[PDB]
Amino acid sequence: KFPRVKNWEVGSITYDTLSAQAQQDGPCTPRRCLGSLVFPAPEQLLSQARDFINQYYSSIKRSGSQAHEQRLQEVEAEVAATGTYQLRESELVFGAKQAWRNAPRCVGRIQWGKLQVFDARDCRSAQEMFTYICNHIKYATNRGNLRSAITVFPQRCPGRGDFRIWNSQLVRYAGYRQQDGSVRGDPANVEITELCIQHGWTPGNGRFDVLPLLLQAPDEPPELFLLPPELVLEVPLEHPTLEWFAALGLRWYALPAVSNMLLEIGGLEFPAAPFSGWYMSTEIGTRNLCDPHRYNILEDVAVCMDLDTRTTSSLWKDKAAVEINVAVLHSYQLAKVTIVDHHAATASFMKHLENEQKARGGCPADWAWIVPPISGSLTPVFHQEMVNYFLSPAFRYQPDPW
Amino acid sequence: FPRVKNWEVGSITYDTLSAQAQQDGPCTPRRCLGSLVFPAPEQLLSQARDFINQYYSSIKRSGSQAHEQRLQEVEAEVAATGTYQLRESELVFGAKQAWRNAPRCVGRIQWGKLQVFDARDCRSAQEMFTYICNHIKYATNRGNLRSAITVFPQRCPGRGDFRIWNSQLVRYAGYRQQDGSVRGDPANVEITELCIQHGWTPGNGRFDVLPLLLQAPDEPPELFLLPPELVLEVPLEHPTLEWFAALGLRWYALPAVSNMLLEIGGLEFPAAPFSGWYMSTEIGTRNLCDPHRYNILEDVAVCMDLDTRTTSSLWKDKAAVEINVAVLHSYQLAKVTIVDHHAATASFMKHLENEQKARGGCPADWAWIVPPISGSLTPVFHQEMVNYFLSPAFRYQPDPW
Numbered sequence: 052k053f054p055r056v057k058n059w060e061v062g063s064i065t066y067d068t069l070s071a072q073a074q075q076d077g078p079c080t081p082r083r084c085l086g087s088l089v090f091p092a093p094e095q096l097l098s099q100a101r102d103f104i105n106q107y108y109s110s111i112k113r114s115g116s117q118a119h120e121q122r123l124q125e126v127e128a129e130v131a132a133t134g135t136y137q138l139r140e141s142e143l144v145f146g147a148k149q150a151w152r153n154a155p156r157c158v159g160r161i162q163w164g165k166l167q168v169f170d171a172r173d174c175r176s177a178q179e180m181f182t183y184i185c186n187h188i189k190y191a192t193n194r195g196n197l198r199s200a201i202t203v204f205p206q207r208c209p210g211r212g213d214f215r216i217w218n219s220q221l222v223r224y225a226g227y228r229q230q231d232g233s234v235r236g237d238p239a240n241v242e243i244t245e246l247c248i249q250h251g252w253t254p255g256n257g258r259f260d261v262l263p264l265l266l267q268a269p270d271e272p273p274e275l276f277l278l279p280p281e282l283v284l285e286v287p288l289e290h291p292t293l294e295w296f297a298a299l300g301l302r303w304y305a306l307p308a309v310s311n312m313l314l315e316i317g318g319l320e321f322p323a324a325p326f327s328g329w330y331m332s333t334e335i336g337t338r339n340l341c342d343p344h345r346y347n348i349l350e351d352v353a354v355c356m357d358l359d360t361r362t363t364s365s366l367w368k369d370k371a372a373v374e375i376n377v378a379v380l381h382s383y384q385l386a387k388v389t390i391v392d393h394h395a396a397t398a399s400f401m402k403h404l405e406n407e408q409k410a411r412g413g414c415p416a417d418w419a420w421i422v423p424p425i426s427g428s429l430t431p432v433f434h435q436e437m438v439n440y441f442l443s444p445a446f447r448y449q450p451d452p453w
Numbered sequence: 454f455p456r457v458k459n460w461e462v463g464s465i466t467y468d469t470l471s472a473q474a475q476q477d478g479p480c481t482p483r484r485c486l487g488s489l490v491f492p493a494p495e496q497l498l499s500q501a502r503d504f505i506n507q508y509y510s511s512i513k514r515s516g517s518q519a520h521e522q523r524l525q526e527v528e529a530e531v532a533a534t535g536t537y538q539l540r541e542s543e544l545v546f547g548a549k550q551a552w553r554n555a556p557r558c559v560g561r562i563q564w565g566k567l568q569v570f571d572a573r574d575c576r577s578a579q580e581m582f583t584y585i586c587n588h589i590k591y592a593t594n595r596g597n598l599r600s601a602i603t604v605f606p607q608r609c610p611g612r613g614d615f616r617i618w619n620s621q622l623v624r625y626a627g628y629r630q631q632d633g634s635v636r637g638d639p640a641n642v643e644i645t646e647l648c649i650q651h652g653w654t655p656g657n658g659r660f661d662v663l664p665l666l667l668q669a670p671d672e673p674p675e676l677f678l679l680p681p682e683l684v685l686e687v688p689l690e691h692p693t694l695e696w697f698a699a700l701g702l703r704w705y706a707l708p709a710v711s712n713m714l715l716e717i718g719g720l721e722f723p724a725a726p727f728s729g730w731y732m733s734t735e736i737g738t739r740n741l742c743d744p745h746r747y748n749i750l751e752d753v754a755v756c757m758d759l760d761t762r763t764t765s766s767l768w769k770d771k772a773a774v775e776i777n778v779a780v781l782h783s784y785q786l787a788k789v790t791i792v793d794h795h796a797a798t799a800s801f802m803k804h805l806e807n808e809q810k811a812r813g814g815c816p817a818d819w820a821w822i823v824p825p826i827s828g829s830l831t832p833v834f835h836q837e838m839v840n841y842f843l844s845p846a847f848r849y850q851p852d853p854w
């Protein structure tokens with residue numbers, strides 16, 4: 052009664068029993084599939100808590116024990132007396148790892164069990180928030196030997212404002228609009244750049260200016276904090292055999308650190324809980340450097356390669372893109388900054404799929420996001436059927452706080 | 454009505470065509486199964502009536518007394534015999550719509566230009582083979598390829614069906630080996646075993662064109678040898694890598710799918726081979742580079758002097774891109790029609806804009822429309838799509854063995 056899932060490179064077949072536990076409705080119906088869309092309390096808070104507690108006690112191999120029975124009753128009574136309830140730190144750690152493990156669009160999930168979870172739930176001010184973030188950046192960067200981490204700020208609560216990081220990531224490059232409708236710098240960040248300026252930031256004019264953080268303590272206006280440049284590790288981009296590539300003057304930063312998603316665990320919501328790992332090379336070379344609405348260097352590189360850019364059948368776009376990705380991988384390895392190419396990353400996601408089939412009966416996976424944006428069918432994930440569903444704990448999108 | 458966004462531009466459309474989705478797909482609100490490869494007299498009449506109504510709607514003849522007479526003819530036919538037969542123009546319109554409705558086809562900008570060969574009077578496997586040979590000749594057209602479909606008799610209760618046991622009309626032999634491996638195309642090992650067990654003396658080359666197994670109702674399937682100059686082939690050479698020709702690679706001009714079932718107005722055609730022209734990545738990326746096909750990536754990378762030790766040299770991506778260059782160049786040099794994935798996805802974007810005005814949407818399967826290399830360099834990548842099943846349609850069907 053469960054979905055049959057085939058790998059078409061090998062012929063293997065598995066059945067995803069985990070999808071029965073799907074705690075939320077997606078956008079597809081038997082009459083049309085919407086899987087390609089980018090963006091699709093009392094006895095309700097309570098139902099999510101019990102399910103989360105069941106998961107926790109299963110993970111420590113104590114399902115049904117007296118302590119399991121007691122914590123369920125204990126949470127049930129803290130809800131009634133207060134509305135909300137508090138996670139034990141061991142449950143917070145487990146729940147943050149689970150949100151990662153559950154995230155269908157992440158190809159990096161082989162690593163999910165080795166996340167460092169920093170407990171910032173006692174944080175009181177924006178200044179304290181900045182200190183926690185700097186500690187996160189320092190630990191995760193680790194001089195180039197990057198380590199996965201998450202810092203979880205206090206949960207949302209009635210009677211108190213939310214903690215929020217206004218930036219979409221901890222490290223972002225400014226984007227300044229030019230006369231001729233072009234963006235100097237990263238065009239994706241034109242908006243947050245406006246807000247940093249309007250809140251006191253002295254802007255620069257480079258193509259790679261690191262933005263300040265806009266931090267929001269409860270019921271406060273957001274506060275501006277400049278990142279110390281010794282904290283933000285960057286990589287100059289160069290090509291192992293095209294010496295003119297270095298004269299493009301391109302760079303990227305080491306640490307991908309998403310700061311605008313909401314973390315949900317057992318009914319509780321943490322609207323500021325930034326997390327970081329390390330980059331897959333296609334995110335920098337193909338999306339960030341090549342997209343027409345980002346840095347959009349593809350044709351420039353093609354011309355330097357002396358490719359015929361007037362006819363698509365030369366595959367000049369395809370050739371220039373591969374070489375930009377080669378440059379990214381070479382440059383991170385040269386600078387001794389962790390990076391994974393899309394062949395390694397997808398090979399490890401296949402191992403994750405095997406692991407999860409044993410451990411839980413399946414794995415939620417969003418095929419269109421797991422398959423890299425270049426060379427899709429040259430990777431094993433392309434030939435793997437996948438089932439997409441929502442499990443909690445989860446990372447969720449949330450509205451901009453402005 | 455689902456809201457559909459293009460993320461490169463920011464434009465929005467609403468798909469109102471999906472409301473008329475006849476069948477049910479694999480997905481539910483609790484889990485999406487969109488990546489899955491394979492998802493009664495009153496029944497026939499209701500589909501027949503729906504299709505007849507579609508036909509007269511498209512020619513602006515809804516309600517007219519010709520529309521009424523046709524509906525009555527089907528009512529009487531199905532009452533008498535449990536089935537009915539299509540008029541010639543209905544057949545042609547049904548074949549075009551089935552192509553137009555195919556969510557996985559990126560070449561649908563061409564949907565209005567389709568040659569339809571009516572073979573519904575076919576009597577034998579020998580006659581079927583004659584019809585197939587005419588199709589290949591018309592469709593190949595000295596390399597100036599023309600889209601075409603030939604339709605054999607409808608199925609019916611009782612007697613067996615006309616089937617083409619080959620998945621395509623042109624397929625290279627796959628030879629299961631004395632030592633485990635495969636010689637030729639590994640995707641055709643099953644069908645190659647069946648041709649041997651029906652009296653084909655096999656070859657031992659990597660590109661041996663298979664015979665066609667053709668089967669008349671209840672009568673058995675019989676082998677048929679294809680004339681060697683009916684089947685056009687393109688030797689693969691590279692524009693600047695002179696050693697590429699020494700690999701002895703080739704491919705055939707005509708992609709001709711012979712194993713799908715055509716469904717029009719409740720009737721079903723188990724034998725209705727259709728053909729178009731190749732998108733280069735189909736040959737260069739899937740057929741030659743898939744590890745379960747010819748799997749040439751490493752051999753090409755070694756000839757390119759690339760570092761195959763570690764994946765972070767991107768030797769796979771470089772070799773694949775040059776194989777696709779060689780395909781495009783070799784088909785262009787040989788004057789055989791081919792389209793590269795950039796031009797095909799550009800035309801599918803225009804197709805999506807055409808279909809929005811005409812029908813209020815367009816069913817499209819994102820994972821099959823995005824090309825297998827350089828996906829995000831093509832305009833379809835940043836385009837949300839809605840997948841749903843309209844009729845008339847091409848559908849899969851079980852193997853005849």
Ligand code: HEM
Binds near residue numbers: 151162396420
């Ligand atoms: C450690 C190495 C990691 C790798 C290689 C990796 C890789 C990726 C990639 C390639 C994407 C899709 C981005 C795109 O398509 O443009 C993604 C998304 C995502 N990742 Fe991972 N990631 C890593 C670490 C983490 C960590 C530590 C977390 C959370 C604790 C996480 C959670 C997510 C989530 C929630 C998404 C979806 C983001 C969205 O939809 O906006 N990842 N990841």
Ligand code: HEM
Binds near residue numbers: 557601728
């Ligand atoms: C004329 C130029 C054509 C081009 C460039 C083209 C291209 C393609 C491509 C690239 C695919 C996906 C192949 C794959 O993913 O392996 C496809 C699928 C498909 N096309 Fe077209 N095609 C053309 C003509 C036709 C014609 C003439 C018909 C029918 C009358 C047709 C009907 C279909 C169907 C039913 C599928 C789905 C096959 C499947 O799901 O396995 N196409 N086409």
Ligand SMILES: Cc1cc(N)nc(CCc2c(F)c(F)cc(CCCN(C)C)c2F)c1
Binds near residue numbers: 089220326329
């Ligand atoms: C922890 C981590 C490690 C890693 N290697 N990569 C990431 C990338 C996450 C991420 C972005 F950073 C981004 F800018 C854009 C997207 C897609 C769109 C976002 N959403 C609005 C639909 C995205 F998924 C995260």
Ligand SMILES: Cc1cc(N)nc(CCc2c(F)c(F)cc(CCCN(C)C)c2F)c1
Binds near residue numbers: 836
């Ligand atoms: C269907 C699909 C599959 C897949 N794998 N990836 C994507 C990424 C698409 C995408 C986003 F998701 C997004 F948040 C933002 C943008 C740019 C917005 C431009 N504008 C703000 C200047 C974008 F193009 C789409």
Ligand SMILES: Cc1cc(N)nc(CCc2c(F)c(F)cc(CCCN(C)C)c2F)c1
Binds near residue numbers: 710
């Ligand atoms: C008319 C036409 C023109 C053109 N350019 N390409 C085609 C390709 C159709 C097609 C094949 F022929 C094939 F062998 C294999 C597949 C993959 C799916 C396998 N299917 C059994 C699930 C495929 F999509 C058809």
Ligand SMILES: Cc1cc(N)nc(CCc2c(F)c(F)cc(CCCN(C)C)c2F)c1
Binds near residue numbers: 059435488640820
């Ligand atoms: C997910 C996805 C997306 C997309 N766009 N294309 C595909 C094509 C994959 C595919 C097939 F569809 C197929 F029918 C047969 C094979 C080989 C099987 C041979 N093996 C059993 C002996 C295959 F690899 C898959």
Ligand SMILES: [Gd]
């Ligand atoms: Gd104050």
Ligand SMILES: [Gd]
Binds near residue numbers: 292
């Ligand atoms: Gd050089």
Ligand SMILES: [Gd]
Binds near residue numbers: 530537538
């Ligand atoms: Gd008749």
Ligand SMILES: [Gd]
């Ligand atoms: Gd040499």
Ligand SMILES: [Zn+2]
Binds near residue numbers: 083485
């Ligand atoms: Zn779906």
